[PDB]
Design an enzyme around this catalytic site. Structure first.
Site, short mmCIF file in Angstrom:
data_model
loop_
_atom_site.label_atom_id
_atom_site.label_comp_id
_atom_site.label_asym_id
_atom_site.label_seq_id
_atom_site.Cartn_x
_atom_site.Cartn_y
_atom_site.Cartn_z
N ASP A 1 38.62 35.49 107.35
CA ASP A 1 38.49 36.76 108.03
C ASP A 1 36.99 36.96 108.23
O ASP A 1 36.25 37.26 107.29
CB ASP A 1 39.05 37.87 107.15
CG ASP A 1 38.90 39.27 107.77
OD1 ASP A 1 38.59 39.40 108.98
OD2 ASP A 1 39.11 40.26 107.03
N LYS B 1 29.61 40.73 115.45
CA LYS B 1 30.95 40.69 116.02
C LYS B 1 31.12 41.70 117.17
O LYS B 1 32.01 41.56 118.01
CB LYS B 1 31.98 41.00 114.93
CG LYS B 1 33.43 40.63 115.26
CD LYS B 1 34.30 40.88 114.05
CE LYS B 1 35.80 40.72 114.34
NZ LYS B 1 36.61 40.88 113.09
N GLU C 1 43.88 38.76 114.05
CA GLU C 1 43.86 39.41 112.73
C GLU C 1 45.20 40.09 112.33
O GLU C 1 45.63 39.96 111.19
CB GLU C 1 42.70 40.42 112.65
CG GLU C 1 41.35 39.76 112.46
CD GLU C 1 40.18 40.57 112.98
OE1 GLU C 1 40.26 41.81 113.05
OE2 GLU C 1 39.16 39.95 113.31
N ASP D 1 45.13 49.22 111.16
CA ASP D 1 43.91 48.65 110.58
C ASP D 1 42.78 49.68 110.56
O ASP D 1 42.09 49.90 111.57
CB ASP D 1 43.48 47.36 111.32
CG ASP D 1 42.31 46.62 110.66
OD1 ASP D 1 41.60 47.19 109.80
OD2 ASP D 1 42.08 45.44 111.00
#
Ligand SMILES: Nc1ncnc2c1nc(N)n2[C@@H]1O[C@H](CO)[C@@H](O)[C@H]1O
Length: 377
Positions: free
Chosen positions: A6, A67, A171, A195
């Site tokens: 991850d 990211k 994910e 999430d």
């Protein structure tokens, strides 16, 4: 041996499926997640906890949130917006961002995937330190909303790191895989992944049939997370200090930091007990700040923000052309999903539908990636 990684915006996590079970791997500091931070000094390159720890001493040479940049064009709405609050320099190299830093006194430039490759190198080394073996095969996860360019730059970051990237997996798919949702049989199932981390909120709906996945919709709020909840606690306590001492602590950066750190810690306690106590000696002008906060007051301070998480959920359902009744499974990802009120709002919204929450929500994506990596290896 294959690992699942991850690669997160703020923290990264590596797992390995060995002897029938996933082991979430602790780094050199004993931490099961590692900050996605890289720092450059007069003498060295620091990655992870060591980088995060010296951010205040060296902010312009300490890179994070890569990211948010990876696989993007410089003029991407996202690159432009987050750029406003990054102490590091982002230069434009023919339409695509590089980060520029000072390193060994010499000015150096890096593509976002070069920085991400450094973080991936750290996670690779973290795995090799635990296992006592070479680690080359990896599954790396990405958000479901990542485009071709974002996915390819992520894969590249791995290759540079010396990883054999077996697959790039979404994910929310990895989270689903962690809970063995892909091992269910017969009829097509609709899965909602909720999430909620420190900074970001991501909702995904997937369909699974006979272990075959499809993404149906994604929604969220790119700036709603546990950090917002901490702000409401801080505001609450600043007002309280004003009320009891007729003193405004808010221009003292060190007092506010002490309070804020204390607040996020109390928040975590409030996820498993119904009150939390705080003692900060000599917080402002020598005045001690001893206080407490109930779970209910915490919930009250965040009421709009908590209920508001339901809106991206409605959006995701709309865009997937599904009714809330047509959701078979719900999966909790991110540290902020430990909040009981958030779980109750979601558990109730879905008419009392149960929630997949048994796996450490900070680790569920790496968990599934690690399961898939061993299968693919
Ligand atoms: N037990 C808990 N209760 C409430 N929030 C929690 C939490 N654990 C974490 N990590 N968080 C938050 O998750 C984010 C990423 O770690 C941060 O905002 C943490 O405070």
């Amino acid at each position: 041996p294959a690992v699942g990684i991850d690669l997160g915006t703020t923290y990264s996590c590596v797992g390995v499926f060995q002897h029938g079970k996933v082991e979430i791997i602790a780094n050199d500091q004993g931490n099961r997640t590692t900050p996605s931070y890289v720092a450059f000094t007069d003498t060295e390159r620091l990655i992870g906890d060591a980088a995060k720890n010296q951010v205040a001493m060296n902010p312009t040479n300490t890179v994070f949130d890569a990211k948010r940049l990876i696989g993007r064009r410089f003029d991407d709405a996202v690159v432009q917006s987050d750029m406003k609050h990054w102490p590091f320099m982002v230069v434009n190299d023919a339409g695509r961002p590089k980060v520029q830093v000072e390193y060994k006194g010499e000015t150096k430039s890096f593509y976002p995937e070069e920085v991400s490759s450094m973080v991936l190198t750290k996670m690779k080394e973290i795995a090799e330190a635990y296992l006592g073996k070479t680690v080359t095969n990896a599954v790396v996860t990405v958000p479901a909303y990542f485009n071709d360019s974002q996915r390819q730059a992520t894969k590249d970051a791995g290759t540079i790191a010396g990883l054999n990237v077996l697959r790039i997996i979404n994910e929310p798919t990895a989270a689903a895989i962690a809970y063995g949702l892909d091992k269910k049989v017969g009829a097509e199932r609709n899965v909602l992944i909720f999430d909620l981390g420190g900074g970001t909120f991501d909702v995904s709906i997937l369909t699974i049939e006979d272990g075959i996945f499809e993404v149906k919709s994604t929604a969220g709020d790119t700036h709603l997370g546990g950090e917002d909840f901490d702000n409401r606690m801080v505001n609450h306590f600043i007002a309280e200090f004003k009320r009891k001492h007729k003193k405004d602590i808010s221009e003292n950066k060190r007092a506010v930091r002490r309070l804020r750190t204390a607040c996020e810690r109390a928040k975590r306690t409030l996820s498993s007990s119904t009150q939390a106590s705080i003692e900060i000696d000599s917080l402002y002008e020598g005045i001690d700040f001893y206080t407490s906060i109930t779970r209910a007051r915490f919930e009250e301070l965040n009421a709009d923000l908590f209920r508001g998480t339901l809106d991206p959920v409605e959006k995701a359902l709309r865009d997937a052309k599904l009714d809330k009744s047509q959701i078979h499974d719900i999966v909790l990802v991110g540290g902020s999903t430990r909040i009981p009120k958030i779980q109750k709002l979601l558990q109730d919204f879905f008419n009392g539908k149960e929630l997949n929450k048994s796996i450490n929500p900070d680790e569920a994506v790496a968990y599934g990636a690690a399961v898939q990596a061993a299968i693919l290896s």
